[PDB]
Amino acid sequence: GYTLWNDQIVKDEEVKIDKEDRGYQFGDGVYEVVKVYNGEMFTVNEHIDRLYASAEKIRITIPYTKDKFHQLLHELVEKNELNTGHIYFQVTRGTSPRAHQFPENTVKPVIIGYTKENPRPLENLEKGVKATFVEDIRWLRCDIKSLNLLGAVLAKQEAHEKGCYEAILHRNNTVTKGSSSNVFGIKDGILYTHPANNMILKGITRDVVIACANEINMPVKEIPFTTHEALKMDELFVTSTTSEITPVIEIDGKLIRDGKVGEWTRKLQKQFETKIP
Amino acid sequence: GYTLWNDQIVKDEEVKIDKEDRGYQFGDGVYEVVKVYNGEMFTVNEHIDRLYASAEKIRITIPYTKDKFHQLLHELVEKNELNTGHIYFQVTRGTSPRAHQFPENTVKPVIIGYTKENPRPLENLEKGVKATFVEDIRWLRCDIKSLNLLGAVLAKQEAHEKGCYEAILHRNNTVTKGSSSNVFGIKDGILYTHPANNMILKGITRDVVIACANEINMPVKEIPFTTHEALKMDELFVTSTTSEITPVIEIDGKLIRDGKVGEWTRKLQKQFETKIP
Ligand SMILES: *Cc1c(COP(=O)(O)O)cnc(C)c1O
Numbered sequence: 001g002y003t004l005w006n007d008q009i010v011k012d013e014e015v016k017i018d019k020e021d022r023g024y025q026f027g028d029g030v031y032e033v034v035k036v037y038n039g040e041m042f043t044v045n046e047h048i049d050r051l052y053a054s055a056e057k058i059r060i061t062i063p064y065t066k067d068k069f070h071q072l073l074h075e076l077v078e079k080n081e082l083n084t085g086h087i088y089f090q091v092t093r094g095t096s097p098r099a100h101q102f103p104e105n106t107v108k109p110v111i112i113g114y115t116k117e118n119p120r121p122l123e124n125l126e127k128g129v130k131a132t133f134v135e136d137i138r139w140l141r142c143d144i145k146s147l148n149l150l151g152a153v154l155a156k157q158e159a160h161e162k163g164c165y166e167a168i169l170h171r172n173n174t175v176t177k178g179s180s181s182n183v184f185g186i187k188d189g190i191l192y193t194h195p196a197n198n199m200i201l202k203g204i205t206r207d208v209v210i211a212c213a214n215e216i217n218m219p220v221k222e223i224p225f226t227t228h229e230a231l232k233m234d235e236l237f238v239t240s241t242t243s244e245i246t247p248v249i250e251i252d253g254k255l256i257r258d259g260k261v262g263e264w265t266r267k268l269q270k271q272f273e274t275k276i277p
Numbered sequence: 278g279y280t281l282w283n284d285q286i287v288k289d290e291e292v293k294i295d296k297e298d299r300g301y302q303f304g305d306g307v308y309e310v311v312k313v314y315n316g317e318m319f320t321v322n323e324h325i326d327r328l329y330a331s332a333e334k335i336r337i338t339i340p341y342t343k344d345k346f347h348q349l350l351h352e353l354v355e356k357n358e359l360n361t362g363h364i365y366f367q368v369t370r371g372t373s374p375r376a377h378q379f380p381e382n383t384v385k386p387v388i389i390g391y392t393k394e395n396p397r398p399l400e401n402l403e404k405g406v407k408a409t410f411v412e413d414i415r416w417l418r419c420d421i422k423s424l425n426l427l428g429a430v431l432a433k434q435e436a437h438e439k440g441c442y443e444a445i446l447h448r449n450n451t452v453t454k455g456s457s458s459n460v461f462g463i464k465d466g467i468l469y470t471h472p473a474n475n476m477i478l479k480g481i482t483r484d485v486v487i488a489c490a491n492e493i494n495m496p497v498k499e500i501p502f503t504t505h506e507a508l509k510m511d512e513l514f515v516t517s518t519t520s521e522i523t524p525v526i527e528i529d530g531k532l533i534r535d536g537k538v539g540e541w542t543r544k545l546q547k548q549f550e551t552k553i554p
Pocket residue numbers: 033142145177178179180181182201202203204205206239240241242
C-alpha cells in the first residue's frame with residue numbers, strides 16, 4: 001500500500017522511523033482517525049482542525065496549510081483505493097538527540113498517514129455491547145488527542161480479558177470516558193454526558209450526536225453522572241469515529257434496564273445515519 | 278556508532294523502526310538509563326531488575342535472561358568505546374496493526390539500546406540549581422518507568438523557559454517528584470522524601486542516597502511534604518542517574534535558606550562519591 005510521509009506518498013517499505021523520533025521516546029506527538037464511507041471522508045475538516053489545534057496545544061508547528069493537508073489526505077485514499085474503512089494520521093515534533101525539553105525550531109515534524117479497509121461494526125450497532133467499569137488513571141490533558149496512550153491500552157486490555165468491548169473509566173466514581181470513546185446516558189428521554197474539560201476529549205462523533213439530539217427535539221444536559229447512576233439508566237451508549245453509536249446493553253453482568261437497545265438510541269442512530277455519505 | 282537491536286549490536290544505519298511499533302503509537306514500552314564512569318557501568322544489576330520489573334507490570338515478556346542482557350550491554354560499551362557518559366535502552370511490545378488491546382503472544386518485543394558521551398554535571402553539583410513548582414498532571418502509574426512521558430516533557434520545558442534546571446511537581450500541594458528526578462528535603466539534620474507509591478518512580482539513585490544516609494548516621498523520614506514546607510527547608514536537592522545529587526538552591530525566586538549548598542548535602546555528595554567507580 002501507500003503511506004503519507006511528510007509531503008510524500010510512498011510505498012510502505014520505503015518508510016522508516018528513527019529511534020530518536022520524539023514520538024517514539026516521549027510520546028511527543030498528536031493524531032486523528034478519519035472514517036471513509038465508499039471513498040468519502042466523513043467530517044474531514046472537523047478532524048483536520050482538531051489535529052492543528054492539538055498540535056498547537058503542545059507548541060508543535062505543522063509545516064502545511066490545512067489545504068495542503070486536505071489534498072494530501074485525498075491523494076492517499078485514491079492511491080490505496082480505499083472504499084470503506086479509515087485513515088490514520090499523526091505528527092511528532094520530529095527527530096533530535098534525547099532530551100525532555102523542546103529542541104531547536106530547526107527540527108522538522110515527522111508526519112505519517114495510512115489506510116485500512118474496515119467495515120462498519122453493524123452487528124454491534126444493532127445488538128449492542130458489553131462493558132466494564134475501570135478506574136481512570138490517565139493523565140490530566142485528555143483534551144489533547146496525543147500519543148500518550150499507555151493509560152488507555154491497559155484499560156482496553158482489561159476489558160478484553162473479561163470479554164467486554166469497552167472499559168468505562170471513572171475518577172472519584174464519576175463516569176468520565178471510555179478508553180477510546182465518549183459515554184452517553186439516557187434517562188426519561190433526556191441525553192446526559194460529561195461536559196467538555198481536561199477530563200475528556202471533546203469527540204467529533206460526540207458533537208454530531210448532540211446536533212442530532214437537537215435536531216430530533218431531544219433535550220441534552222452535559223451533567224456528570226456517577227457509576228451507580230449509570231447502572232440506573234434506561235439506555236447507555238458510547239461514541240467514537242469508528243464505533244459510531246454503539247449501544248451498551250450490559251455493564252459487569254448488570255443489564256441496563258432490560259438489556260435491549262433503547263428507542264431513543266435508535267432515533268439517534270437513525271438521525272446520525274442521514275449525515276453519513 | 279553501534280546500536281543494540283534486539284539481540285544484535287549493529288550500526289545505527291542498519292536499524293529501522295516500523296510505524297506500527299506499539300511504542301511509537303501507544304507509548305507501550307519501558308526503559309532505563311545507566312551511567313558509565315570510565316568504562317565502568319554504575320549499578321547495572323539494579324537497573325536491569327527494574328527494567329524487567331517495569332515490563333512485567335505491563336505484561337511484556339523480555340525474550341532474554343538478565344545475563345544475556347547484561348552481556349549485551351557490556352559489548353555495547355566496548356564497541357562504542359564509551360568512557361564517561363550513559364546507556365539508554367528500551368523495550369516496546371512490538372509491531373502489530375493498530376489496536377489498543379494487546380496483540381498475540383506471537384509478536385516479539387523490539388529492543389533498542391545506545392550510548393552517549395556525557396560528563397558529570399560538575400558545575401551543578403557544586404553551585405546548585407534553580408527550580409520551579411509545576412503541577413503534577415501525569416498518569417497514575419509512575420511506579421513504572423514507561424514511555425508515556427508527555428507530562429514530563431511539558432514540565433521540563435516550562436522550567437527551561439523560566440531558565441530553571443528542573444520542575445518540582447506537586448499534586449494537592451504535596452510535593453511528589455521532579456519531571457525526571459526524585460526530590461529530597463532536609464530540616465534539622467533529618468532527611469525527608471515522598472514514600473514509594475504509584476505517585477513516584479522508585480529511583481536507583483534515590484535508594485543509594487538513602488543508603489548513604491544510613492552509613493553517615495542520618496535520620497531518614499519518608500514523609501511527604503507540602504510546597505509550603507518545601508520552601509522552609511534548611512537544604513533541598515534532587516536525584517537521578519544523570520544528575521546524581523544536584524542541589525536546588527532556589528525555587529521561583531525564593532532562596533532555600535541562604536541560597537548556598539547545605540552541609541548535609543555536602544556529606545551525602547561526599548559519601549555518594551565513595552560508591553562511584
Ligand atoms: C479519539 C478519542 C475519542 C473519540 O473522538 P472521536 O472524534 O469521536 O473519534 C474519545 N475519547 C478519547 C480518550 C479519544 O482518544
